[PDB]
Amino acid sequence: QQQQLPAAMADTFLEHLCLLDIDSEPVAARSTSIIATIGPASRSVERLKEMIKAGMNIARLNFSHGSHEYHAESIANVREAVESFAGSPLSYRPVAIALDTKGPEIRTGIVLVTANTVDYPNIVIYIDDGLISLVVVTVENGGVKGVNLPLPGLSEQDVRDLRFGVEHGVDIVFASFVRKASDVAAVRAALGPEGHGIKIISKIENHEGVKRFDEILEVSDGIMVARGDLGIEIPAEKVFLAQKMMIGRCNLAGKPVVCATQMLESMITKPRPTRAETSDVANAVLDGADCIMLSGETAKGNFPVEAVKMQHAIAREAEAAVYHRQLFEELRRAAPLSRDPTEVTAIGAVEAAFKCCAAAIIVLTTTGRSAQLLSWYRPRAAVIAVTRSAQAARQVHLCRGVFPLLYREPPEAIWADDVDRRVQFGIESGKLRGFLRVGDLVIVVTGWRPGSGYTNIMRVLSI
Amino acid sequence: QQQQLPAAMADTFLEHLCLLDIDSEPVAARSTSIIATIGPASRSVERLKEMIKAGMNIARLNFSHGSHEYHAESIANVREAVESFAGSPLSYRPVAIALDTKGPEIRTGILQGGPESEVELVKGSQVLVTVDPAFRTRGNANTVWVDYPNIVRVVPVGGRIYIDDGLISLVVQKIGPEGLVTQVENGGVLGSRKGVNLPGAQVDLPGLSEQDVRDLRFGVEHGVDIVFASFVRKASDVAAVRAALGPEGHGIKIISKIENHEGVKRFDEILEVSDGIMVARGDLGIEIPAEKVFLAQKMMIGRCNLAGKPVVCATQMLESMITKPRPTRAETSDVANAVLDGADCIMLSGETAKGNFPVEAVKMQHAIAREAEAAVYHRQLFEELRRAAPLSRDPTEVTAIGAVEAAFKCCAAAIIVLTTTGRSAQLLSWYRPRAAVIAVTRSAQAARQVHLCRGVFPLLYREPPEAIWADDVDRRVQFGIESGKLRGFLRVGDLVIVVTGWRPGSGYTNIMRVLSI
Amino acid sequence: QQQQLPAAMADTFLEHLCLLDIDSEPVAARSTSIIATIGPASRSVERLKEMIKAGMNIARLNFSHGSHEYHAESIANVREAVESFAGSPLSYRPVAIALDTKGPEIRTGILQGGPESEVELVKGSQVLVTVDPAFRTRGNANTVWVDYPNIVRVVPVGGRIYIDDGLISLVVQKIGPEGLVTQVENGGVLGSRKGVNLPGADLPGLSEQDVRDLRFGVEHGVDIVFASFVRKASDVAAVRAALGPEGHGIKIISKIENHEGVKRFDEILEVSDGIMVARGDLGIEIPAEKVFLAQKMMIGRCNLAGKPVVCATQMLESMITKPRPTRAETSDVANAVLDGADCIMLSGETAKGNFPVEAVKMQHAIAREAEAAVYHRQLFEELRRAAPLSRDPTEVTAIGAVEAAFKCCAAAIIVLTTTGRSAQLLSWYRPRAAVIAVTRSAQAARQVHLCRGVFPLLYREPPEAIWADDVDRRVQFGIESGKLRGFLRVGDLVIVVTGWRPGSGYTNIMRVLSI
Amino acid sequence: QQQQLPAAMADTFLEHLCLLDIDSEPVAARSTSIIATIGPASRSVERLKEMIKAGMNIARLNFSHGSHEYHAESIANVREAVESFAGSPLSYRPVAIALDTKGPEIRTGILESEVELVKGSQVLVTVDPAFRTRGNANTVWVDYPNIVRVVPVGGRIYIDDGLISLVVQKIGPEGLVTQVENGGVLGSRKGVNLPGAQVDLPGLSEQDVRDLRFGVEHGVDIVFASFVRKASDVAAVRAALGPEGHGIKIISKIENHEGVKRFDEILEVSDGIMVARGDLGIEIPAEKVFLAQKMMIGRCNLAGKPVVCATQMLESMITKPRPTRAETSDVANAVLDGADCIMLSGETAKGNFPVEAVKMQHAIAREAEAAVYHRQLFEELRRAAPLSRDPTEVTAIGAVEAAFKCCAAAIIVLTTTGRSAQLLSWYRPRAAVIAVTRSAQAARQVHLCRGVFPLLYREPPEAIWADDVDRRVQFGIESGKLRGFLRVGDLVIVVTGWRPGSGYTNIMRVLSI
Numbered sequence A: 001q002q003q004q005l006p007a008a009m010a011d012t013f014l015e016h017l018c019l020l021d022i023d024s025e026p027v028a029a030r031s032t033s034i035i036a037t038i039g040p041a042s043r044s045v046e047r048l049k050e051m052i053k054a055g056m057n058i059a060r061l062n063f064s065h066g067s068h069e070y071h072a073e074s075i076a077n078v079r080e081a082v083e084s085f086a087g088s089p090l091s092y093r094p095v096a097i098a099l100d101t102k103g104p105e106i107r108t109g110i111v112l113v114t115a116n117t118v119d120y121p122n123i124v125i126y127i128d129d130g131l132i133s134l135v136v137v138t139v140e141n142g143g144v145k146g147v148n149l150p151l152p153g154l155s156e157q158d159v160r161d162l163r164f165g166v167e168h169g170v171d172i173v174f175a176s177f178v179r180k181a182s183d184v185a186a187v188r189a190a191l192g193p194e195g196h197g198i199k200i201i202s203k204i205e206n207h208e209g210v211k212r213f214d215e216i217l218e219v220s221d222g223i224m225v226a227r228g229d230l231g232i233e234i235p236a237e238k239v240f241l242a243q244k245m246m247i248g249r250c251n252l253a254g255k256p257v258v259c260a261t262q263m264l265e266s267m268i269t270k271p272r273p274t275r276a277e278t279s280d281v282a283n284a285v286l287d288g289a290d291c292i293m294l295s296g297e298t299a300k301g302n303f304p305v306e307a308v309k310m311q312h313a314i315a316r317e318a319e320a321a322v323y324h325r326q327l328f329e330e331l332r333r334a335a336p337l338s339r340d341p342t343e344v345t346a347i348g349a350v351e352a353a354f355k356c357c358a359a360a361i362i363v364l365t366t367t368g369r370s371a372q373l374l375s376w377y378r379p380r381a382a383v384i385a386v387t388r389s390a391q392a393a394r395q396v397h398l399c400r401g402v403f404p405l406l407y408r409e410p411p412e413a414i415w416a417d418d419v420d421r422r423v424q425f426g427i428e429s430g431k432l433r434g435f436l437r438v439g440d441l442v443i444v445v446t447g448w449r450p451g452s453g454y455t456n457i458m459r460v461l462s463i
Numbered sequence B: 001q002q003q004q005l006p007a008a009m010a011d012t013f014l015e016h017l018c019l020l021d022i023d024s025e026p027v028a029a030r031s032t033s034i035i036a037t038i039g040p041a042s043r044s045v046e047r048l049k050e051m052i053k054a055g056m057n058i059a060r061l062n063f064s065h066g067s068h069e070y071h072a073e074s075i076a077n078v079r080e081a082v083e084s085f086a087g088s089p090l091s092y093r094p095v096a097i098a099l100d101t102k103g104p105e106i107r108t109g110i111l112q113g114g115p116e117s118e119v120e121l122v123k124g125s126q127v128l129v130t131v132d133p134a135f136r137t138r139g140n141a142n143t144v145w146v147d148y149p150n151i152v153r154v155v156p157v158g159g160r161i162y163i164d165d166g167l168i169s170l171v172v173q174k175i176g177p178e179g180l181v182t183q184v185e186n187g188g189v190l191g192s193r194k195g196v197n198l199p200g201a202q203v204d205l206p207g208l209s210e211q212d213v214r215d216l217r218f219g220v221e222h223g224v225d226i227v228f229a230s231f232v233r234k235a236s237d238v239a240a241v242r243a244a245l246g247p248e249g250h251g252i253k254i255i256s257k258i259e260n261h262e263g264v265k266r267f268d269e270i271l272e273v274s275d276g277i278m279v280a281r282g283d284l285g286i287e288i289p290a291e292k293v294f295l296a297q298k299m300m301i302g303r304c305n306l307a308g309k310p311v312v313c314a315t316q317m318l319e320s321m322i323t324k325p326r327p328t329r330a331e332t333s334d335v336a337n338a339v340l341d342g343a344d345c346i347m348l349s350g351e352t353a354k355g356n357f358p359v360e361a362v363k364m365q366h367a368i369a370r371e372a373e374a375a376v377y378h379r380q381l382f383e384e385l386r387r388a389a390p391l392s393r394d395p396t397e398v399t400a401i402g403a404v405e406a407a408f409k410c411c412a413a414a415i416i417v418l419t420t421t422g423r424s425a426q427l428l429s430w431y432r433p434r435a436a437v438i439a440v441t442r443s444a445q446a447a448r449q450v451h452l453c454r455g456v457f458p459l460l461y462r463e464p465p466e467a468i469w470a471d472d473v474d475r476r477v478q479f480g481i482e483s484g485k486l487r488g489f490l491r492v493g494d495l496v497i498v499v500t501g502w503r504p505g506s507g508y509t510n511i512m513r514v515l516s517i
Numbered sequence C: 001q002q003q004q005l006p007a008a009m010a011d012t013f014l015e016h017l018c019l020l021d022i023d024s025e026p027v028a029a030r031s032t033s034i035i036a037t038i039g040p041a042s043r044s045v046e047r048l049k050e051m052i053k054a055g056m057n058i059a060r061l062n063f064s065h066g067s068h069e070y071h072a073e074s075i076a077n078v079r080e081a082v083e084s085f086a087g088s089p090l091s092y093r094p095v096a097i098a099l100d101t102k103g104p105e106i107r108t109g110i111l112q113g114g115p116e117s118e119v120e121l122v123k124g125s126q127v128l129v130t131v132d133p134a135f136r137t138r139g140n141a142n143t144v145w146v147d148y149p150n151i152v153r154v155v156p157v158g159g160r161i162y163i164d165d166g167l168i169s170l171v172v173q174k175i176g177p178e179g180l181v182t183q184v185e186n187g188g189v190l191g192s193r194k195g196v197n198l199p200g201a202d203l204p205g206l207s208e209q210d211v212r213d214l215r216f217g218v219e220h221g222v223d224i225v226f227a228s229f230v231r232k233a234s235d236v237a238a239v240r241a242a243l244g245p246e247g248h249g250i251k252i253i254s255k256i257e258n259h260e261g262v263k264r265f266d267e268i269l270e271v272s273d274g275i276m277v278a279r280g281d282l283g284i285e286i287p288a289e290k291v292f293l294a295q296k297m298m299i300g301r302c303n304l305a306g307k308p309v310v311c312a313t314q315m316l317e318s319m320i321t322k323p324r325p326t327r328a329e330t331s332d333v334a335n336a337v338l339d340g341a342d343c344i345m346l347s348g349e350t351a352k353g354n355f356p357v358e359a360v361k362m363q364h365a366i367a368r369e370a371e372a373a374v375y376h377r378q379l380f381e382e383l384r385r386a387a388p389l390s391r392d393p394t395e396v397t398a399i400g401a402v403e404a405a406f407k408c409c410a411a412a413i414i415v416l417t418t419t420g421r422s423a424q425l426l427s428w429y430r431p432r433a434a435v436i437a438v439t440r441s442a443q444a445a446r447q448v449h450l451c452r453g454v455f456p457l458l459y460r461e462p463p464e465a466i467w468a469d470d471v472d473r474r475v476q477f478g479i480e481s482g483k484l485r486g487f488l489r490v491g492d493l494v495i496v497v498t499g500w501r502p503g504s505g506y507t508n509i510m511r512v513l514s515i
Numbered sequence D: 001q002q003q004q005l006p007a008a009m010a011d012t013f014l015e016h017l018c019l020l021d022i023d024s025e026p027v028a029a030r031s032t033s034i035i036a037t038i039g040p041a042s043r044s045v046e047r048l049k050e051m052i053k054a055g056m057n058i059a060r061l062n063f064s065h066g067s068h069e070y071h072a073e074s075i076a077n078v079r080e081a082v083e084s085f086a087g088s089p090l091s092y093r094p095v096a097i098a099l100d101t102k103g104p105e106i107r108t109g110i111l112e113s114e115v116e117l118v119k120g121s122q123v124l125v126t127v128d129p130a131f132r133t134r135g136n137a138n139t140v141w142v143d144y145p146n147i148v149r150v151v152p153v154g155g156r157i158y159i160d161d162g163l164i165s166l167v168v169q170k171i172g173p174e175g176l177v178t179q180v181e182n183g184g185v186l187g188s189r190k191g192v193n194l195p196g197a198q199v200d201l202p203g204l205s206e207q208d209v210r211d212l213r214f215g216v217e218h219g220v221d222i223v224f225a226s227f228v229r230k231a232s233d234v235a236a237v238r239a240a241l242g243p244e245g246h247g248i249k250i251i252s253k254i255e256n257h258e259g260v261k262r263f264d265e266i267l268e269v270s271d272g273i274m275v276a277r278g279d280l281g282i283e284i285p286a287e288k289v290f291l292a293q294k295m296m297i298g299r300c301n302l303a304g305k306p307v308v309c310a311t312q313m314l315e316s317m318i319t320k321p322r323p324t325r326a327e328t329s330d331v332a333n334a335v336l337d338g339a340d341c342i343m344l345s346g347e348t349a350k351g352n353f354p355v356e357a358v359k360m361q362h363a364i365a366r367e368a369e370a371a372v373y374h375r376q377l378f379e380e381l382r383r384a385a386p387l388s389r390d391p392t393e394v395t396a397i398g399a400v401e402a403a404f405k406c407c408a409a410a411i412i413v414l415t416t417t418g419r420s421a422q423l424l425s426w427y428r429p430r431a432a433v434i435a436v437t438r439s440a441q442a443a444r445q446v447h448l449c450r451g452v453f454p455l456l457y458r459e460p461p462e463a464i465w466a467d468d469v470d471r472r473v474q475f476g477i478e479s480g481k482l483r484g485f486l487r488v489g490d491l492v493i494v495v496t497g498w499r500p501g502s503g504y505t506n507i508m509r510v511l512s513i
């Protein structure tokens, strides 16, 4: 069998692992999203072209580096690479643009903290990547940038940066050093009226944030486990607890979670990843992460495309080995009851999908909310979302296993007939890229009248 | 809270019990069906009228007694009692009519000048069983006759021979030239024509006698809805019934009676060809040790649950009520477990055919079953299905499971299903929602056969079809809603699930929608 | 396979059922205890002898009837029938003797020259209920006499009055300065000295008599007190008070017979030794549709707390008159057992019916099967989970002994016990292997019948010089006994639980032996 | 609370995660074992001393390199560092010695220079005696003659950690004309993999035989066998191992498809299994290892045999004083997966941070283990485990259950071979399993099992077996106190037998301290 089905039917977790099969080829669209950071190594349009084709979904601007002019070009490039496949509505792959806020970093001069002597005033102690170590009139590690010490979250610059972001129609803000819920209100304030549209993904990068995680989760659209700083700010042995914990809470709350930093580092320099790294990816996926990310790997290294091609392979397998069985069960039980017709339909659509090994669930969505309520349960069938809002169609990448499709055609006269052309559009698209073959069954989720908020029907159709 | 919700939310089975509340008033239509047997105590229309109001759902004809003329009258009466409430399509309660085949019985002679007379059998007494046309009548206390000749060549020295209801007991302590000479291991008053069983003995009687055939033919002729088949012992036996039923009655459901070892042994082949099963505790508790029935019942109700087919739990659930206006603790308790075991319906015999308290008997089944059902631990139960249930590719199954799950999510009050044959209602109850499954159908027959299914509530839709299929479907749906409101399954504000199809005709259900009332 | 093993391995409850086998002969001591009430039908010694051999474990004195002198004789007869098998220490089956407190009953009078003669109460007719002692002996179709004086300043007009097992029925329409004037709502054939129930309508739990009765109990060495109409934990403190210093030994089994009791059931569980679900009065005091929930609930909480629970009244009624039980009745037993019941009981069936021995032989059969169909799997699991942690070497061993038993399909767990405590902590988990308890205290060896699947063996031999060697003769004694009565055959494994030094409270060792 | 207890009591896996606490200090012996490979970076006695103190448990000789004389010295050093703490029988930490068989490698020739191979550029692969050292940017020589007859036209050929890639483009008379599909700096005598070729090279060469003979002669405790591909292969090793060493545990390395394919037959005949991510990760797609790992650890768990997770768990430390996030997290999952021990290679043999590499595997494993969800876990075994009639199985399960009931601090077992200790850890108590034995060897082999802490008992036997058994028990408790596994008031479980000798465990007792 394929997609680890035998292992998907085991009665306990153990037997399940006992049943994983290295010759059980996956056969599914990979559903974890890929965020690639744009940098010299990947700024050109041609390179972008390739990285999409490889599976990129979200491009990341790192405002820790580079002028505004510099990033203006980056967006401009992404967008161009992207529209180069406007070629064929059935294959067009939207790409998000996320701006990674620079935040209150602490760099150093171009041992007495002030080779022997070293821009955060009230400092009055680790330099670079945490390889260098000094202790308070102080040096405990050696070595030939960041400065982390186990400031305002929103500087004048940060503000300036978000304004830029709004002005340029970025889709997502990854917010650096969120340490308390007031901090995301800040971002959202700076973002201004013109941009309630933009998802806020709070970065967790230190103890306090870890500590106040719950308040933070409640006000954000999602979370980023920033193992980079976090893994210096706290003992390096503990991160795996913060990640696992955070992915889990996030999973419960129905919000997209991102696992970050050093998942494929060696590739910065080399054409294959270590065994550690490969295995780092599978587990982030198995853990529950919504999307997994690349930095050095894509921004400066000799193998940007290859980096992306891997996350894509690893994630495919990983996702074929998820123990939905225990997993879906666990949710229903944990999920509180609900009276909102959309929740209700989605849980239905999902149960339905399991009963028949549905190939996909197809949902007309305006904002994507309903797409999202389908993946809260983590179907295994693909969630194909047909929408006209190129933006929703993009933001929908923050959600496991939802595959946006942007629908261009001008509305029919008759609502009924339009809905149907949008559905069938999904199916067509579906066939074309190979999510469904004739004979398959498919679930289709829709509404009883035009506009967001009214999803409430589920239907079973054979292809 | 009501309907045992807090016990419905317990993390384990044990906690769940620990949480049952005797001041947690149920609040749901009872969903185990009640079969009442019609007899003198309940053959009048007025009485019939009462017993429906009390919750009867299926009337049972016991072709082990009485002429065809006699049973004609019974149908004729049910039907009349039943249309006495045609008075409001929203309250009209269809009722099944089930013919309980008489099968290969072994009753005894009519006593000495006594169709009323009772001899009295004494412990430690020689008794002659005979097969002589002579003693056909000539019953005494030292002699009995049996309508099953071959019994001499089939009971060996030492074997036990049971008379009337297992209550009277005898052991063959001498085979020879005419009688079998037995010692009365069991005492008590014997009648005319009572029942005989010979455990550990292999009975050879055809499942389907000429009569049995005759009876089915009558049944088809009069439009009964269900055949309960006595003594089914192997799947060829139901092919028999269905054969005799003839072309004019593929419509009729066949409910194989399990009444002995062999049948229990070949239970699987049996289950596969029938529409359901009846656990016939009566004979089955004489045919095997009486300590072992409870296993046959619990096993059979389980397998049946799995297969998706309606199962019935039978005989002596309320016996003391044949004589008495209240049940023993045993009896009350016996019902709750039938329902907690999984039983699709639970039945009444003496209790409704003979006894001084027919209506009351039915009122009780109804109360008991309400509580038992409120006390069902769906939680573990639904789970266990999904898991046991194999995968399926049939759009209907798929919808039903969906509808169901959807109903849990919102505490849906009802699932409304348009159905032509009932199939689709059935697939909804296979999972045992807890919301009521209201089935709107134009086939008065299906609408009746649907009573064999836990928590389905037929509504017969009369109106002639609209021009536009769409509009028709919608008047049928709303019909259900109206009905629903009227009898109190749903109040404004409630949510409801509606299950329908994409084109006219059976076999195409495939849509599920959520509507507020 | 036997003992429903294939159904014992099923992955869910459902498949478990799906796999019960009527041709899967049990092969296990039955572990639910049988309580038989003693009465004329079962008072003789020879009958007694028979009923033991059939499986009786506990004889029940019903102090609702019969003088002290009468019950004295009964005990004296049990004990004799019992010691008639002292003849082989390896077979001897101890029997308990339990006294069933009469409590705050309400019964009618004897009939107008009618100790076994009946009036016939007719539906819709006037019945004069009376409190006048002059009429005590004057029962007719128009007058029932009741031994509860206050019934007149307690039962309101409109009120209902059930008579004889809730079968007769009477509605109070006028309070009189000398009695009640009711219209018969339900009629039937009314006899003498019959139980009266005034539901929804000051009788002390412990009357002077009750006290008198316990004193008798203690005086004669009864083992258990089944306490009628316990409605609140202060009621058992009362019984225990009356039982007095000479009897802390005696187990107290609080009887649940009404709403309040059901309502306060927790406080009552906590102070008693066990509980009896008295379906009789319970089934009249509350709606009859609800008992099955007070039974299921009570059995469960009891199961959780580690306390024996008893399932009572009308399990085999038709046998009072008939040589076979109804299909209801049979299936009532199996569920009591499948529910969790520690012991299941007979009353009419054994005290006044024509089939006492048979009654007992059925409860025995039914319960053997029923115990072969318990779903331990989910069961043992649920316990460990529910059970709190514990730091008491005995719990800790027992849980161990038990898990160990499961691993190997142990045939039995053999336990040395002085008081039986340790036997009990083995059965809290409901092993499936039999818990054989070797003890020198004929009393513990008896009280240990309150516990599911513990089979006492009374060890007579005078102690060896060497503790070690004594322990070992007591173990091996168990094994011998076990072989003899068929709990274990060569090749079986066995678990053996014991202590590191003499006296109660020190169990702490578990060992695996092959036979 | 500590040791992730609140997360320990969650009703489902998810809640369990939701409940992990980064301020919930662990408080338990780490129970995953640490194998560290001895190399220049860690061959001195002083360094060895340090590495033990940091947690090392098993030392690995890699017979892929270095003469016998060379490994003789390594043993001779381990042993010395080790007995440097014979100084207090309560602290002494035994250390295994494991011989990592070299096996059927294909390695290249000699040029510290590195000819650089370039993408596109044609490479000639040879087996020609004469070009043994002539090899160049355009010529690589391999020590496996047959490479030419067995790599079909268009088969791939990797060189060095799969970093160089070559597709056979033609096969002329004197060898493989490939095309450098992946380029790189190439070194000397470097490892070469031919996936989807059917290599005919014998598991057990003459050398391999020679090597085990050395192993036996010198008393190594464990053989990690390279490139086990079928059960007949371990019989070989066991044969070579010879009569004088039935003692030695054989741990079959899994390093390729076939092995992964026959994994069952292989599991049944070995003492354990090594998931060799190195070769395995080049022999199959690299995206698939995590399923070989997860699968093999799980089956292994079921079977009751110790499993090792191998290769590149901390790589960057070869060069750096801290691990990458990837690497850290690689360790925790090995542990959460079920791994019996986790291993170090470059990190301990060649790198600039041997002691540190060991310190980290220690810290990560501590937490990983505190965060184990026994709850679901123990359950899952009992259910999976088939029934058993062996009194030792039965006691262990029992001792274990017992340990959960009272938050036993430790399970103390007298063991002769260690088997019974092993059956205690099959269930993964959470109390430590302290094993008192007189066989310094078992006491070392025992480190292949999660959470078993050998204690070597020296004293000569009492007259009275009873009394002996008791001094051995109490010995544990003493030790136990001394190193802090147990404090007064603690409860403890003790497992023993009814008579002297292996095979007869059968008693379980509860004692308060």
Ligand SMILES: O=P(O)(O)OC[C@H]1O[C@](O)(COP(=O)(O)O)[C@@H](O)[C@@H]1O
Pocket (backbone or CB within 6 Å): A364, A365, A366, A367, A368, A369, A370, A371, A446, A447, A448, A449, A450, A451, A452, A453, A454, A455
């Ligand atoms: O943005 P959401 O919340 O997913 O809403 C999905 C909406 O899409 C629809 O299916 C179609 O809406 P439009 O016709 O406005 O495009 C609605 O029925 C439903 O309300």
Ligand SMILES: O=P(O)(O)OC[C@H]1O[C@](O)(COP(=O)(O)O)[C@@H](O)[C@@H]1O
Pocket (backbone or CB within 6 Å): B418, B419, B420, B421, B422, B423, B424, B425, B499, B500, B501, B502, B503, B504, B505, B506, B507, B508, B509
């Ligand atoms: O009898 P079944 O198999 O339940 O089929 C139910 C049928 O009822 C419908 O909802 C309506 O059918 P009709 O219009 O023929 O009455 C169909 O869509 C569906 O096929």
